Design a binder for this molecule. Sequence first.
Ligand SMILES: CO[C@H]1O[C@H](CO)[C@@H](O)[C@H](O)[C@@H]1O
Ligand SMILES: [Ca+2]
Ligand SMILES: [Ca+2]
Length: 129
Amino acid sequence: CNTCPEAWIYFQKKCYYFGEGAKKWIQARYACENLHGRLVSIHSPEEQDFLTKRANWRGSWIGLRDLDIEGEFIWMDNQPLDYSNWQPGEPNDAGQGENCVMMLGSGKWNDAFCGSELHGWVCDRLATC
Ligand SMILES: CO[C@H]1O[C@H](CO)[C@@H](O)[C@H](O)[C@@H]1O
Ligand SMILES: [Ca+2]
Ligand SMILES: [Ca+2]
């Protein structure tokens, strides 16, 4: 079962959407839902490698946030915190608070101001048959 909707990209049981266009994190959440997916959740080095190689060099939102309880990150897929790719020193909750996670151009993760208008955002879905 490796079928994905038109414009999505298949990798290891999942489908990925490389969205482009300036969006705050919440806007990217709903942009993914409009396409019947969610902001991407990442659970292995192989999945991260797929994303790193394809990531927007200006940065992109992923489906990870600590809005509800500071320091408690939650994935869009509600699965465990079982794989990380933090940029060294991140997350750092800089400014007066950074509660939404992005990939840098290198694929490394950074917590950012949720109102930042990033030019990329990545969604996922399970592949169908
Ligand atoms: C100063 O804030 C910026 O740079 C640091 C890293 O230096 C990040 O943690 C932060 O999210 C911002 O991108
Ligand atoms: Ca935070
Ligand atoms: Ca940060």
